Amino acid sequence: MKINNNFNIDSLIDNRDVAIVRGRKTDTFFKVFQVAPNIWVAPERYYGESLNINEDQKSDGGIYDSNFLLTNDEKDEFLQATVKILQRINNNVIGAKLLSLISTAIPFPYEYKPGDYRQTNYLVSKDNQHYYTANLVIFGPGTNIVENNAVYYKKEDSENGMGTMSEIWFQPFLTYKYDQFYVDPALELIKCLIKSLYYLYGIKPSDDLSIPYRLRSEFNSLEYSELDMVDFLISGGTDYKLLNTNPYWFTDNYFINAPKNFEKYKNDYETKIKNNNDIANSIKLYLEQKFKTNVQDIWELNLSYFSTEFEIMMPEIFNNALNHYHRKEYYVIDYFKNYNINGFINGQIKTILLLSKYNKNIINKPELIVNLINENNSVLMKSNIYGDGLKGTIGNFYAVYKIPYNIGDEDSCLDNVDIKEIDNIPPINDADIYPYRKNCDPFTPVYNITETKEINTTIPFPVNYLQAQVTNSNDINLSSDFLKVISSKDRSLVYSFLDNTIDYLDSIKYDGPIDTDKKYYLWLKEIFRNYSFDMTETQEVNTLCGFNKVVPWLGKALNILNTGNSFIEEFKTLGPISLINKKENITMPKIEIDEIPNSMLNLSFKDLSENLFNIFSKNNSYFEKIYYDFLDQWWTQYYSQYFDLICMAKRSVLAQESLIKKIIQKKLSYLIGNSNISSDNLALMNLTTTNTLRDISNESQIAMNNVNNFLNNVAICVFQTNIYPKFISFMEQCINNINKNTREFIQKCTNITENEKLQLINQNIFSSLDFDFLNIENLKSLFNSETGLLIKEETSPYELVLYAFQEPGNNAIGDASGKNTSIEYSKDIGLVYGINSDALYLNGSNQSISFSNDFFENGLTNSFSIYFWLRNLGKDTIKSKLIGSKEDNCGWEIYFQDTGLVFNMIDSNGNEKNIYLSDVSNNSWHYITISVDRLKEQLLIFIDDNLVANESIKEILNIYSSNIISLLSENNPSYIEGLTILNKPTTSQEVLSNYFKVLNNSYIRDSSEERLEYNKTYQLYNYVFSENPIYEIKQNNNIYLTINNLQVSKFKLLSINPNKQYVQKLDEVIISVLDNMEKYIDISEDNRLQLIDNKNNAKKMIISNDIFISNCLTLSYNGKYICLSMKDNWMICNNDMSKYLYLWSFK
Amino acid sequence: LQYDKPYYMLNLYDPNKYVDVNNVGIRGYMYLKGPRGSVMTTNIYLNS
Known about the structure:
The structure is cut from a larger assembly and holds chains A and B. By secondary structure, chain A is α+β, with helices and mostly antiparallel strands. Helices cover 30% and strands 22% of the residues of chain A. Chain A has 22 helices and 54 strands. By secondary structure, chain B is mostly beta strands. Chain B has strands at residues 18-21, 30-33, 39-41, 45-47. Chain B has a two-stranded antiparallel sheet. Chains A and B meet through α17 of A and loops of B. Chain B: This is Botulinum neurotoxin A heavy chain.
């Protein structure tokens, strides 16, 4: 496909690609541009909805601007933005297939007469002499400018398989930030395109068909919010995982009828149309391609699949009920500045979007007004709880649905679509279009009238706390009494739950003013640390379900069990079920089970047994369906409240983060305006405060993940302890009744003997083994999603992980962490295999590497870690720089010095941490790790796998340096492998794990930590006698090898295959000694190691080692190793001594 | 995993497809094609 981007709002009308047409039958006209075959864009507001409507007719949560998309510049911006999103979608393969399918899914022609067909999809020119073929026209939004939608041209024609045109209301300029990312407008366009697919294939459900979505737990009444069928089928998310089950617990006549109508019209085309020459072959080809894809393919298309394919982060939990949870904020996207063919420029998180002007115009009509009042009915607090725009029924859907006992259950979502075939189709000319008059339903705008009700509460609700935690005052006092915060008539305090930060601010309340930058650094670091200890802190508790990461501040964030001494004590003494309001919500599904047919009475034993087996299988499947229904019911009823808690807690965390940032910025501005600090110090203070704010954001994200995981586990445990026992009891009664019926039926059969009656009775019983469907992995794997993976890899702690390899022609060196780290390296750096991968070889004079990344600038309060593999090839005692970031003497660095290393950390204020590491430069590989943890203020240095240094950096302030980390390795050629910088402190266990994981790659290493190889002249040493080599000496007409308490023996390893170079673990070896003529090893009768000359008489030993030891290999033969002998000291093949004797090494 | 023991191929990204050769020669290549098919015995098992 090719999207036409060469159109502007003032292009001349060519009567083919750009024209002016009429919407429906009304006298309104508008300009449209054909971007791809049969798909048009109308860069104008939707004609059907009036641009101005009454105030009470406004939809809550909607932004109304009658002047939007009015001027020609705005229309051209809309056209270009829509074309850019179209190009982005088309560039991906799956998006291109979707676009081709929409371009070829023409509505079925209407047979006005037998053999006479008239099109339904057409657009009428101004004077009504030109007709345009269009499957889909993309408009601007209707009355509400944030309401993306898709509507059908004709209702019945789009309901019964014929199909209609679709009309899209699209808002490309506005986006909203969900959690930590901006929703891509391309995904919303894709969702509307899929809805247009539903319309084009005539598979639109009846309006009353709608699965339940949430339980309106905010009210005091029983009511279920149920979502439309198309919205649930195409939205995706975790909710779609509770319906797309095998087998299907929810089925309806629609899913049977829709394929029927599709096949009916397919037959109509292939019999009547395909052989008819009355219409152009273009319609033949379009219908052929439309019918080449069935209805199951359209059904399996949903936003989860496109999120996975396009790698787009989307809401995943209750994503169609966000207007109750997420009060959105809107950002304007400049498609020449903040967008391109690859989505948001520099990712969906790292891009910056200007706040839209419309956020103040967001209409806020809440479904509930909560009023906290005291004993004397005085109005203390007032807050708004919003609806979701979903139809709320008063009847329990789960108590009325009848799970179908009898049903039949049996690839890429759009695998059958051929883009090349659809592109090759010539378009439909204007001269061969015969329209059908009544092809369009009269459009009627639909206005949703929300209802408002009041509630008076003596106990604060979570929204009371959430709204009391936000303030507009810039002089904020974080209080610790919500009742006092509300009762504060001065409107000065703001409620908070950070006891450490509040106490620290109270302690420095009488502290002297911060005159210099050093005091500012101290204050900022202390505030960051107190905030991170307040927010990210979690505690493991053992509940009736397991070990759970209870996050204690929720009690003071959402008014959850504040009565007790602590949140954890109440959470334990009350159980998980206490965290929600409506706790007894599970009802037994209405289930019918067919009794055994009586016609089987006159059946033979084998046929009766086979029918009973079929009944058994169907009963098991029905029980599984009942479990799926119970799972969906538990979700919709109980996990809705827990996700309300999740979103409220995340909003509380964001409010606290904003308050802390307000405090930081007000202090920084006051210091800038009212201090004698030098101007360059003020500039560095601003630069450092930016990084500190970024780190505060990261700590907030950590807290959000913590509360999310805690509440997910709590909900799963609620399902464990509350829903499953009820399912078990109901299923026990059901299996008891079915067993009784089957036993009676067998005892009533006439053609069956008594022994065969007993056999069939015992063969077809039901017990707990048949409805024991509980699976914890599936319950905790519901919440896994592509959005989670993308967030996890985007916020990955790996700031830099150097990767290097050799391609035919050159060597590739770079960053593999996925961040924006740029690498500039001297092109004369070779790559040689190190431990596990390639390693950079540095001359030490002109070989330079520079890693640029913003985080490398470091700062006052960012923890980080640097680890790598270093093998020095120098002997210089001079203090020669190896690697680090040092701008104006400020930063961190590591230099060679003596035979070891020196780690240096210099801050702006002059405080210096200088540490020396001994025995590091030995022509041997060493795994070096540094961990700077600003929370506990700890500096950890590991060499190989030993904690060589553990210092306190409590006296190190801002170390802001340049963004460049430079690897020079002055004056010492060296091998550097696996360079890695993380933004997280590293513990000892992680260092040990990384060391052993890299080392344990099934390779045999000599004393030099390098790779041992065949046909190399080594020298053998013992672990116990590493200082004492092995000598060859003649005795008893033979030659024997021994140590001395003597010419040193030369050792080589030989393999059977001449294609093997290095020696891998667990392989056969022939040991060889280089004499005047080469000789091999053998084991004599006394198990002594004899030297022989025969080539084939030498037998093959086995090489192994222990993963706990880097390079102390062991040689064995037939289950008996080689060990040092007693003093007499040769080697013997015996296993009646200490383990240290079997150990060996090579050099 | 053992040498000299024929194995059929599967890809974790797209299980429904299996490996096949287009042609043998210098210009040939290997590719994935489907559907995997299905072996079923009623009320007992149904797998690709």
